Amino acid sequence: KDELLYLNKAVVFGSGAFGTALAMVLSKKCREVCVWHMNEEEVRLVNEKRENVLFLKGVQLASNITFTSDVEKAYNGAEIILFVIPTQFLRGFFEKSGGNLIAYAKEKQVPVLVCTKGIERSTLKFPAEIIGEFLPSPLLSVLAGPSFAIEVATGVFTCVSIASADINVARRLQRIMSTGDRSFVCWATTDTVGCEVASAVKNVLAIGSGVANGLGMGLNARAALIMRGLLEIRDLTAALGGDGSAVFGLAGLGDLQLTCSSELSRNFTVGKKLGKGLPIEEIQRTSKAVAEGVATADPLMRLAKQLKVKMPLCHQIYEIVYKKKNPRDALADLLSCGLQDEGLPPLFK
Amino acid sequence: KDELLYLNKAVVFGSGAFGTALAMVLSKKCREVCVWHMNEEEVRLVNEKRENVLFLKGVQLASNITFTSDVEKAYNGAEIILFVIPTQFLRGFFEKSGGNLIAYAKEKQVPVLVCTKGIERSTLKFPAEIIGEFLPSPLLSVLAGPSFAIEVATGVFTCVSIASADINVARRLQRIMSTGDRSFVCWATTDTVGCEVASAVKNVLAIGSGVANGLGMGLNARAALIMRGLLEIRDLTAALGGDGSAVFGLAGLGDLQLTCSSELSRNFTVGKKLGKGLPIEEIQRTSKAVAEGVATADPLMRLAKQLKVKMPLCHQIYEIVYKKKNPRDALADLLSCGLQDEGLPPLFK
Numbered sequence: 122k123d124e125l126l127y128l129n130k131a132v133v134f135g136s137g138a139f140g141t142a143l144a145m146v147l148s149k150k151c152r153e154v155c156v157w158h159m160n161e162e163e164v165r166l167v168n169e170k171r172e173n174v175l176f177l178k179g180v181q182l183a184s185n186i187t188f189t190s191d192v193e194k195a196y197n198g199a200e201i202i203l204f205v206i207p208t209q210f211l212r213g214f215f216e217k218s219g220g221n222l223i224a225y226a227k228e229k230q231v232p233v234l235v236c237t238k239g240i241e242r243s244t245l246k247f248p249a250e251i252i253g254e255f256l257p258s259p260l261l262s263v264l265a266g267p268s269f270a271i272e273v274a275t276g277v278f279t280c281v282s283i284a285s286a287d288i289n290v291a292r293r294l295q296r297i298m299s300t301g302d303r304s305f306v307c308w309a310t311t312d313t314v315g316c317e318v319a320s321a322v323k324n325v326l327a328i329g330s331g332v333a334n335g336l337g338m339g340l341n342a343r344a345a346l347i348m349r350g351l352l353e354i355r356d357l358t359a360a361l362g363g364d365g366s367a368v369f370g371l372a373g374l375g376d377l378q379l380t381c382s383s384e385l386s387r388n389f390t391v392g393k394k395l396g397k398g399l400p401i402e403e404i405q406r407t408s409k410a411v412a413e414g415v416a417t418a419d420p421l422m423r424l425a426k427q428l429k430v431k432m433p434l435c436h437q438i439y440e441i442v443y444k445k446k447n448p449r450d451a452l453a454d455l456l457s458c459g460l461q462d463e464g465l466p467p468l469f470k
Numbered sequence: 471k472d473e474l475l476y477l478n479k480a481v482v483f484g485s486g487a488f489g490t491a492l493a494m495v496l497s498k499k500c501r502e503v504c505v506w507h508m509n510e511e512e513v514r515l516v517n518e519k520r521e522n523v524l525f526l527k528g529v530q531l532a533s534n535i536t537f538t539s540d541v542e543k544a545y546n547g548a549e550i551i552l553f554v555i556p557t558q559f560l561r562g563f564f565e566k567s568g569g570n571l572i573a574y575a576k577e578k579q580v581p582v583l584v585c586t587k588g589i590e591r592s593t594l595k596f597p598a599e600i601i602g603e604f605l606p607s608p609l610l611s612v613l614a615g616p617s618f619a620i621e622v623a624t625g626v627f628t629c630v631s632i633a634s635a636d637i638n639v640a641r642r643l644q645r646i647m648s649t650g651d652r653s654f655v656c657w658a659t660t661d662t663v664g665c666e667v668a669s670a671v672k673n674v675l676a677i678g679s680g681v682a683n684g685l686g687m688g689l690n691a692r693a694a695l696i697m698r699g700l701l702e703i704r705d706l707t708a709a710l711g712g713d714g715s716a717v718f719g720l721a722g723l724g725d726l727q728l729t730c731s732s733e734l735s736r737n738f739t740v741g742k743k744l745g746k747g748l749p750i751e752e753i754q755r756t757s758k759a760v761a762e763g764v765a766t767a768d769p770l771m772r773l774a775k776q777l778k779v780k781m782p783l784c785h786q787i788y789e790i791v792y793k794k795k796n797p798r799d800a801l802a803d804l805l806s807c808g809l810q811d812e813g814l815p816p817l818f819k
């Protein structure tokens with residue numbers, strides 16, 4: 122079935138750049154799209170201006186997108202639910218505001234699409250695992266790929282993966298999310314673990330790429346970091362029981378290479394500033410958008426230690442981000458290994 | 471052993487941007503480096519200016535680099551030979567000027583490092599196979615990775631792969647080419663087929679990335695092209711009997727992602743101009759540097775046909791370059807497939 126599905130209503134819990142961008146996609150597919158934001162005064166401003174002046178400036182909202190601070194008005198009648206709340210705020214949302222949403226989603230068996238990327242600080246859980254404490258796992262699918270919000274929001278060609286345990290669920294969602302003007306194209310997979318691992322780790326690597334840039338290194342170095350970094354995604358995926366199909370697909374390779382290669386990435390930008398010598402405390406004090414890699418770096422290290430997975434690049438980035446290791450010392454220690462084989466396994470016999 | 475090796479002399483056959491860049495690397499490892507160039511008047515100019523004003527403007531040559539037009543003086547006493555002559559000119563060099571060089575390399579068993587990328591028009595041969603008509607296989611190794619000439623020549627951090635059938639040869643060359651200031655770092659491998667396929671095909675794909683950019687597409691689109699394109703490298707590598715370890719290594723993923731992402735790529739730049747509406751004939755007449763993808767695209771299609779390997783992106787790129795196909799029509803034909811699975815095989819159970 123290559124034919125598109127359309128809905129009466131979608132709800133997006135996530136008022137940031139990406140939640141808004143995905144609301145813009147859904148506006149083409151749904152009669153009505155509701156976006157939930159926590160602050161009522163800010164909601165009124167966004168609705169009045171027909172522009173998310175908080176988190177996606179310069180993009181006029183479609184008329185069929187409405188912001189609200191009322192969780193129940195947001196989800197009522199929704200036929201798909203998207204979560205795009207940043208990782209470290211997801212749990213709080215369900216604890217504070219999620220009770221009746223949970224009962225609704227369960228009652229009406231509403232598909233949930235997790236678009237958040239990262240690892241939660243103390244629990245070491247991926248976003249879908251956080252959500253899985255509150256909602257049944259069969260309702261949960263994962264969206265992941267190279268999808269900068271500004272390009273997605275304005276309908277510039279974008280490919281993403283949708284992962285679900287059951288491939289027929291992924292294929293249905295692919296028909297809901299994909300657009301007939303071919304601006305947003307989804308590809309189905311079952312590798313939910315590979316998708317979420319790649320998504321979380323790629324943000325940490327992107328800080329590394331930004332550090333390289335800030336230190337005055339070039340495009341050759343960036344390419345080397347992407348290539349060696351993907352190995353870390355691959356090894357963690359294997360240790361966590363993922364089948365690894367996502368690693369060299371849109372969620373892994375595609376998103377990793379995208380995020381490591383542009384200042385549009387908030388994580389890249391954090392890296393650049395660290396490489397130029399700013400402390401993380403000042404970066405984060407003056408930042409108006411979430412850089413998930415910052416909070417992910419520590420729980421990623423703890424998870425990898427637990428599973429005995431060596432992640433040399435992510436380890437040094439963690440040292441820079443959380444232990445104030447001078448980026449030049451981190452670089453030196455990274456390259457202290459001496460000469461080696463590329464060391465990749467054959468794909469073929 | 472990971473201690474560096476130093477030579478008395480190296481010779482580089484290839485006076486272009488990359489040959490000159492690699493001579494700059496070798497000037498750190500060798501007492502003397504000779505670069506062969508076909509034209510004596512231009513040789514005198516380069517030597518006088520202490521700058522390759524023909525093909526690498528703005529970079530001052532090390533004092534221990536000398537250009538020459540005399541083949542026999544170039545290789546005399548050299549303990550490594552690099553070939554960096556563009557693919558379509560390699561054969562002519564051996565037929566017209568290579569007789570004594572060939573005897574020297576054989577008699578003294580001098581390691582030869584092939585740095586040229588592409589596929590030769592009539593024969594469908596990779597650069598090491600062309601050279602392999604004249605020099606025996608145990609002397610041939612291949613250099614491949616994300617290594618833009620300007621960054622290499624000026625000592626900005628670069629990683630490359632060196633492939634040889636015997637891993638011990640590759641590891642020896644790695645010790646000769648890698649620098650102690652850690653500016654140029656080599657990784658050993660045996661996947662010579664994978665390296666050379668990736669090197670040839672990535673140039674064609676880079677034209678495609680350029681076309682996307684010239685058509686006004688964004689970074690999300692670029693990431694998708696890189697991800698899908700690598701599958702074509704992978705499939706062709708399998709058909710040609712490579713073990714595929716290089717596909718997601720520096721030669722494949724690394725070099726592809728680099729070349730598809732920067733106007734420093736000659737092939738990207740050709741693509742961009744094609745995407746903007748310029749005919750290939752105008753591009754080629756105002757071109758001051760080789761775009762290997764242009765000439766490669768034809769034999770690449772013939773080889774893929776011969777092997778029954780589908781290469782959907784490379785096919786459309788070939789149509790744009792050789793058959794006057796409107797880039798917008800090529801894009802439409804690419805995007806007419808309907809919704810699919812990502813369809814990558816698992817790496818693990």
Ligand SMILES: NC(=O)c1c[n+]([C@@H]2O[C@H](COP(=O)([O-])OP(=O)(O)OC[C@H]3O[C@@H](n4cnc5c(N)ncnc54)[C@H](O)[C@@H]3O)[C@@H](O)[C@H]2O)ccc1[C@H](O)C(=O)COP(=O)(O)O
Pocket residue numbers: 135136137138139140141158159176205206207208210236237238239266267268269270271324327376380385386387388389409410411412413
């Ligand atoms: N922005 C993107 O391009 C992008 C974003 N994501 C993910 O989307 C998630 C949402 O982040 P966002 O980009 O929408 O973030 P803003 O920083 O734009 O929004 C902040 C939201 O958080 C709320 N918020 C802020 N503070 C609080 C507190 N204290 N409490 C509760 N709620 C709060 C606020 O009200 C907004 O709703 C996050 O997990 C990202 O990893 C995935 C895909 C893409 C891209 O493919 C991508 O991955 C981009 O890479 P990158 O390197 O990430 O740019």
Ligand SMILES: NC(=O)c1c[n+]([C@@H]2O[C@H](COP(=O)([O-])OP(=O)(O)OC[C@H]3O[C@@H](n4cnc5c(N)ncnc54)[C@H](O)[C@@H]3O)[C@@H](O)[C@H]2O)ccc1[C@H](O)C(=O)COP(=O)(O)O
Pocket residue numbers: 484485486487488489490507508525554555556557559585586587588615616617618619620673676725729734735736737738758759760761762
């Ligand atoms: N330039 C690079 O950054 C680069 C270049 N290469 C390869 O190096 C090989 C040599 O190319 P070059 O870049 O040095 O090319 P110039 O165009 O700089 O030199 C032309 C040479 O050809 C001679 N020449 C010119 N016309 C003739 C004729 N008619 N007869 C004989 N000899 C001739 C001339 O005298 C020079 O020696 C070629 O196969 C490339 O694929 C690999 C690695 C890198 C980079 O990683 C890389 O791959 C770059 O990607 P890209 O997309 O390619 O930019």
